[PDB]
Scaffold this active site. Structure first.
Site, PDB file in Angstrom:
ATOM      1  N   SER A  50      32.170 -35.397 -15.314  1.00 12.22           N
ATOM      2  CA  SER A  50      33.318 -35.135 -16.184  1.00 12.22           C
ATOM      3  C   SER A  50      33.233 -33.932 -17.117  1.00 12.22           C
ATOM      4  O   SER A  50      34.264 -33.507 -17.668  1.00 12.22           O
ATOM      5  CB  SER A  50      33.653 -36.385 -17.003  1.00 12.22           C
ATOM      6  OG  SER A  50      33.983 -37.481 -16.158  1.00 12.22           O
ATOM      7  N   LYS A  53      35.574 -31.160 -16.594  1.00 11.38           N
ATOM      8  CA  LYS A  53      36.965 -31.222 -17.012  1.00 11.38           C
ATOM      9  C   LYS A  53      37.285 -30.102 -17.981  1.00 11.38           C
ATOM     10  O   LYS A  53      38.378 -29.530 -17.928  1.00 11.38           O
ATOM     11  CB  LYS A  53      37.298 -32.582 -17.645  1.00 11.38           C
ATOM     12  CG  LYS A  53      37.398 -33.711 -16.628  1.00 11.38           C
ATOM     13  CD  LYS A  53      37.813 -35.020 -17.274  1.00 11.38           C
ATOM     14  CE  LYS A  53      38.108 -36.090 -16.201  1.00 11.38           C
ATOM     15  NZ  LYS A  53      36.895 -36.499 -15.429  1.00 11.38           N
ATOM     16  N   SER A  97      38.821 -39.585 -19.927  1.00 10.84           N
ATOM     17  CA  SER A  97      38.048 -39.236 -18.739  1.00 10.84           C
ATOM     18  C   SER A  97      38.833 -39.620 -17.486  1.00 10.84           C
ATOM     19  O   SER A  97      38.254 -40.049 -16.486  1.00 10.84           O
ATOM     20  CB  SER A  97      36.714 -39.974 -18.719  1.00 10.84           C
ATOM     21  OG  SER A  97      35.981 -39.729 -19.895  1.00 10.84           O
ATOM     22  N   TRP A 190      29.561 -38.913 -16.549  1.00  7.76           N
ATOM     23  CA  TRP A 190      28.785 -39.943 -15.874  1.00  7.76           C
ATOM     24  C   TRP A 190      28.967 -39.743 -14.378  1.00  7.76           C
ATOM     25  O   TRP A 190      30.027 -40.058 -13.831  1.00  7.76           O
ATOM     26  CB  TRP A 190      29.296 -41.332 -16.266  1.00  7.76           C
ATOM     27  CG  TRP A 190      28.387 -42.469 -15.854  1.00  7.76           C
ATOM     28  CD1 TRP A 190      27.525 -42.499 -14.782  1.00  7.76           C
ATOM     29  CD2 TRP A 190      28.284 -43.757 -16.485  1.00  7.76           C
ATOM     30  NE1 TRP A 190      26.899 -43.725 -14.713  1.00  7.76           N
ATOM     31  CE2 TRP A 190      27.346 -44.514 -15.742  1.00  7.76           C
ATOM     32  CE3 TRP A 190      28.895 -44.347 -17.605  1.00  7.76           C
ATOM     33  CZ2 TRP A 190      27.007 -45.833 -16.086  1.00  7.76           C
ATOM     34  CZ3 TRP A 190      28.560 -45.661 -17.944  1.00  7.76           C
ATOM     35  CH2 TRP A 190      27.624 -46.387 -17.184  1.00  7.76           C
ATOM     36  N   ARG A 230      24.993 -42.715 -24.601  1.00  4.88           N
ATOM     37  CA  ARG A 230      24.918 -41.260 -24.639  1.00  4.88           C
ATOM     38  C   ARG A 230      25.345 -40.784 -26.026  1.00  4.88           C
ATOM     39  O   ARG A 230      24.795 -39.823 -26.569  1.00  4.88           O
ATOM     40  CB  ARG A 230      25.849 -40.636 -23.597  1.00  4.88           C
ATOM     41  CG  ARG A 230      25.459 -40.918 -22.166  1.00  4.88           C
ATOM     42  CD  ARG A 230      26.602 -40.596 -21.227  1.00  4.88           C
ATOM     43  NE  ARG A 230      27.836 -41.289 -21.599  1.00  4.88           N
ATOM     44  CZ  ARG A 230      28.934 -41.286 -20.854  1.00  4.88           C
ATOM     45  NH1 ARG A 230      28.928 -40.642 -19.695  1.00  4.88           N
ATOM     46  NH2 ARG A 230      30.029 -41.932 -21.249  1.00  4.88           N
TER      47      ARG A 230
END
Ligand SMILES: C[C@](COC(=O)NCCN)([C@@H](Nc1c(C=O)cc2ccccn12)C(=O)O)S(=O)O
Length: 244
Positions: A50, A53, A97, A190, A230
């Site tokens: 991701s 993005k 996400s 992820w 995270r």
């Protein structure tokens, strides 16, 4: 004050406690600082997942494939998560996400334009292969944590090769937290379609004094592990160093 040894031990312990292997790269001015419990990950390549993005949006907007208020309509088909089964803008999809929205954006951009733009920007190994809608999820595109922290540094300071308006639009999409006058801009990631699975949290801190401190957390995600791990390790590391 606190010794470097103590800071290193404390941040390493954050990854040890999570029972995973990871690193977090911090950049101040031109200097890179590597912390964590598996320092060699710093220059190893992983799929961006991701985190891509951020660049997908930059490209989409710069090349007029979308605008910041355009609403990407949910097509009504079952999604991995209920939260993705709705209509959203690029910014909303960034915060959630929402991969489906970004896959649609990639398809609008097209393989040829995407390969040229990823090359122009020099992102990671710059190779997107032949599938325009999943190259950042399962390869062949890969990038190291050092390259990710440098990409964050460039975006934070508007150094990427995109109109400064474009960069500002995407940056507004990444505000994920405010703490003691400090603002944290970042994008989590992820990669579930690769083994082992990789976890990311890349962004920067904007301190009250206006200074920006870029960072990139990279660790191995394990079965039954929380994505918020995270974030906790990142916030704890940043705090331990006095960055926030
Ligand atoms: C873990 C995140 C978001 O993080 C959250 O825990 N959800 C949150 C929204 N509140 C997200 N992962 C991701 C991708 C981005 O790498 C890409 C895919 C593709 C399929 C299935 C999941 N895919 C997710 O599955 O939810 S990733 O950090 O972007």
């Amino acid at each position: 004050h606190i010794s470097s040894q103590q800071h290193e031990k404390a941040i390493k312990s954050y990854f040890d406690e999570a029972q995973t292997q990871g690193v977090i790269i911090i950049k101040e001015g031109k200097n890179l600082s590597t912390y964590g419990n598996a320092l060699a990950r710093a220059n190893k390549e992983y799929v961006p997942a991701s985190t891509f993005k951020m660049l997908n949006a930059l490209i989409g907007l710069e090349n007029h494939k979308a605008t910041t208020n355009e609403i990407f309509k949910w097509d009504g088909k079952k999604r991995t998560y209920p939260m993705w089964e709705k209509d959203m803008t690029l910014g909303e999809a960034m915060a959630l996400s929402a991969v489906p929205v970004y896959q649609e954006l990639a398809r609008r951009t097209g393989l040829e334009l995407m390969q040229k733009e990823v090359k122009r920007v020099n992102f990671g190994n710059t190779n997107i292969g032949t599938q325009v809608d999943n190259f950042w999820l399962v390869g062949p595109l890969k990038i190291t944590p050092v390259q990710e922290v440098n990409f964050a540094d460039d975006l934070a300071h508007n150094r990427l090769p995109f109109k400064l308006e474009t960069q500002e639009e995407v940056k507004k999409m990444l505000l994920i937290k405010e703490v003691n006058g400090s603002k944290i801009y970042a994008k989590s990631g992820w990669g579930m379609g690769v083994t082992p699975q990789v976890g990311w949290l890349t962004g920067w801190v904007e301190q009250a004094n206006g200074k920006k401190i870029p960072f990139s957390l990279n660790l191995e995600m394990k079965e039954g592990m929380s994505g918020s791990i995270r974030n906790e390790i990142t916030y704890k590391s940043l705090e331990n160093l006095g960055i926030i």
